[PDB]
Write a protein that binds this ligand. Structure first.
Ligand SMILES: O=C1Cc2cc(Nc3ncncc3Cl)ccc2N1
Ligand SMILES: O=C1Cc2cc(Nc3ncncc3Cl)ccc2N1
Ligand SMILES: [Cl-]
Ligand SMILES: [Cl-]
Lengths: 4, 124, 124, 4
């Protein structure tokens, strides 16, 4: 999971 | 927004759609190419091809279970492009590049047409 | 094999599937949650959720145009997860995390359950 | 395009  | 994003989600979705295609699950159309038949999902075909997008948004054709392609279309070129739609992988070779580019132009798959043009230009 | 791969293909496919959902094109099922209705594509739901995969591979249920979820399921939690299925983006917030995790457990969306568990553990 |  990432900060888009 | 303040969303988080799962990097592998899109790839995992496409991998699962290809598994459904392999097992012939919920396929809703047959594409006929020079008497070679290919089962697929209308939505995946529309998501990948400007031609299928136009066909399946047409009020009469959206309801067809069989689509016949132009007789000039090569079944192998179509098969390679159908595999690309469901995997992101294109089996481009010296022996198939002309048929693949011609099929991609007809199907309106601009990114494929682009890489074929570049690979042909490198060989001249 | 000797394939080339188009990096953005899977993401472009999912973006187009979400555009078809927005325009209600070729959606083939209604998911009913506490009298809130959500139109979707069966194949995308199956590609994202172990529950929908099991439902739409069942010989009787594969033919249903309406699916009713368990009354304990929160419509907002479902809406957030449906958006995630079609975009890879999860709108996870302090005010919805419990409903989102409970819905993801029911839908069998293991990666979502995982990030909810981790976000809850960080707040304790 | 890349070599996967
Ligand atoms: O090269 C290409 C690839 C491609 C895909 C589509 N598909 C869609 N476009 C927009 N909203 C939904 C969909 Cl399904 C249309 C044109 C082209 N041209
Ligand atoms: O967490 C999850 C996400 C998920 C998706 C599916 N889908 C499929 N699996 C295998 N072949 C085809 C499909 Cl469509 C099954 C289980 C789970 N569990
Ligand atoms: Cl393309
Ligand atoms: Cl997930």
């Amino acid at each position: 999971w990432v900060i888009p | 927004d303040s969303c988080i994003q799962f990097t592998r989600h899109a790839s995992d979705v496409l991998l699962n759609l290809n598994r459904l295609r392999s097992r012939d699950i919920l396929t809703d159309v047959v594409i006929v190419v020079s008497r070679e038949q290919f089962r697929a999902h209308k939505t995946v075909l529309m998501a990948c091809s400007g031609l299928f997008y136009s066909i399946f948004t047409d009020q009469l054709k959206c309801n067809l279970s069989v689509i016949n392609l132009d007789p000039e279309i090569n079944p192998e070129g179509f098969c390679i492009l159908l595999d690309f739609m469901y995997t992101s992988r294109l089996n481009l070779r010296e022996g198939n590049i002309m048929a693949v580019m011609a099929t991609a132009m007809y199907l309106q798959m601009e990114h494929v047409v682009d890489t074929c043009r570049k690979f042909i230009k490198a060989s001249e």
